[PDB]
């Protein structure tokens, strides 16, 4: 599928050398940064979309995920489907695990306080998770079956807003450095 939406935040720590590719391609080079997330993908999030993806090159030097992500409001929520990582692996407060697309993911939830939010400025607001026990191989033709977590998530009391906002298969990166190129249909 044709991804309509660009996704290029940064609070403004370090360079984050973010190219914006032909289709759904894009590259990001990027050095002692602060937080920054970068990616490709709709504009309205589904719970019923099929994510796929080919990390042509993935090499953070530090923290960084290789993950889906997005929001929804009504309740304010981020979440995340980390399929790969640098050195920390994200983790929280552990509610089981997902079986999808040949991986097994833990589900995790946590808090962020006094945050920016998508609506910008900052404030209090929860984070689902559901990262993979070991890294996904990149190079490959990947596949998210983002349904599968969000049945897993209700499960276990995850319920995410009504009001869908972004969904993008991104970069993200804390104080750290790196490059990656990913390519999302």
Request: no cysteine; aromatic share 16%; charged share 10%.
């Amino acid at each position: 599928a044709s991804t309509d939406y660009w996704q290029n935040w940064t609070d403004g720590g370090g360079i984050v050398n973010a190219v914006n590719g032909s289709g759904g391609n894009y590259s990001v080079n990027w050095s002692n940064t602060g937080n920054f997330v970068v990616g490709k993908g709709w504009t309205t999030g589904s719970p019923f979309r099929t994510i796929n993806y080919n990390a042509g090159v993935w090499a953070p030097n530090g923290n960084g995920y290789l993950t889906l992500y997005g929001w929804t409001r009504s309740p304010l929520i981020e979440y995340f489907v980390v399929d790969s990582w640098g050195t920390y692996r994200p983790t929280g407060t552990y509610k089981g695990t997902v079986k999808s697309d040949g991986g097994t993911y833990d589900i995790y939830t946590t808090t962020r306080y006094n945050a920016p939010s998508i609506d910008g400025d900052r404030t209090t607001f929860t984070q689902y998770w559901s990262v993979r026990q070991s890294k996904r191989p990149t190079g490959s033709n990947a596949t998210i079956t983002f349904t599968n977590h969000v049945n897993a998530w209700k499960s276990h009391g995850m319920n995410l807003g009504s009001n869908w906002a972004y969904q993008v298969m991104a970069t993200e990166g804390y104080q750290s450095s790196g490059s990656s190129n990913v390519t999302v249909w």
